[PDB]
Design a protein around this nucleic acid. Structure first.
Ligand SMILES: COc1c(O)c2c(c3cc(C(=O)N4CCc5c4c(O)c(OC)c4[nH]c(C(=O)N6C[C@@H](Cn7cnc(N)c8ncnc7-8)c7c6cc(O)c6[nH]cc(C)c76)cc54)[nH]c13)CCN2C(N)=O
Ligand SMILES: [Ca+2]
Ligand SMILES: [Ca+2]
Length: 227
DNA sequence: AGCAAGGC
DNA sequence: TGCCTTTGC
């Protein structure tokens, strides 16, 4: 049972606004891994602010506590709300939080949570602390947890000109032989995105290094006309 | 705004 | 394969 007053309040307010007809297609979209209340993102964020303005954003001492309690509730809107709350504490998230973010990645895992945790929060941490990459990324690749492997691929997604090209291509080479849908997809995604910045090096990489066909097609889909 | 980014 | 729905840029 949740015991933090903010979480109890958010649970009551969200639950009061559930829509079972809406919850069904929302849950099916996430392959029925999760129950849903049936609250889509615009309403969900207004209902969150309803609770924040009563209680005030909780002291930062509680932020992990609050996110963990929301992560433990069954309906997916509580994890989506938890991510919205993390965005409000961005300032206080730093390298000491990497293990916490790891736990979130591997608990109630799916693309909707992992893709929100990794490029923003881990991306920012490793930009400030790039000497720490080697303590996490190799371990994530070797874990055969597909969401930590996707995290290794995607933490640089939004780096643009900050991209560590040699590291990106090494990570991709370690994972190119994965059968996994979400790994083949992530490789295609990061290569297509980085090609917006550095197309020539993505072209050369894809022409000289093995990739699954889905990944290769995605990587080059907006630059192949130039070569 | 109106363009862009899983599901099937 | 490429269009759909919802969410993000
Ligand atoms: C080529 O360059 C670009 C441009 O060039 C250019 C623009 C852009 C903008 C981008 C660009 O990139 N954006 C934009 C859109 C987006 C990015 C992005 O980064 C992301 O990652 C950080 C994005 N993450 C998501 C995402 O989380 N989604 C989305 C949704 C799931 N969904 C639905 N329908 C689809 N078709 C999907 N496809 C993949 N997911 C899909 C969904 C979630 C999350 C959830 O919890 C969901 N719960 C239920 C649903 C349905 C659901 C969206 C997203 N790039 C651009 C704007 C103008 N412009 C111009 N003028 O030129
Ligand atoms: Ca392996
Ligand atoms: Ca797609």
């Amino acid at each position: 049972v949740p015991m933090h007053p903010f979480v109890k309040a958010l649970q009551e307010h969200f639950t009061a606004h559930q829509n079972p007809e809406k919850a069904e297609p929302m849950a099916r979209y996430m392959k029925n891994h999760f129950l849903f209340l049936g609250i889509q993102t615009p309403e969900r964020r207004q209902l969150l602010k309803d609770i924040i303005q009563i209680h005030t954003l909780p002291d930062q001492k509680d932020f992990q506590i609050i996110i963990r309690e929301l992560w433990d509730l069954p309906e997916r809107e509580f994890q989506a709300a938890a991510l919205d709350i993390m965005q409000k504490y961005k300032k206080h998230i730093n390298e000491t939080h990497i293990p916490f973010l790891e736990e979130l990645i591997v608990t109630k895992s799916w693309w909707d949570s992992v893709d929100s945790i990794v490029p923003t929060f881990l991306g920012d941490i490793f930009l400030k602390h790039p000497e720490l990459i080697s303590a996490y990324i190799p371990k994530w690749i070797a874990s055969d947890n597909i969401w930590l492997q996707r995290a290794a691929i995607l933490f640089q997604l939004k780096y643009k000109q900050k991209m560590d090209e040699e590291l990106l291509f090494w990570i991709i080479g370690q994972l190119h032989s994965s059968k996994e849908f979400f790994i083949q997809k992530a490789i295609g995604w990061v290569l297509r995105e980085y090609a917006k910045t550095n197309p020539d090096v993505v072209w050369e990489y894809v022409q000289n290094n093995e990739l699954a066909p889905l990944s290769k097609r995605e990587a080059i889909k907006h630059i192949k006309q130039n070569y």
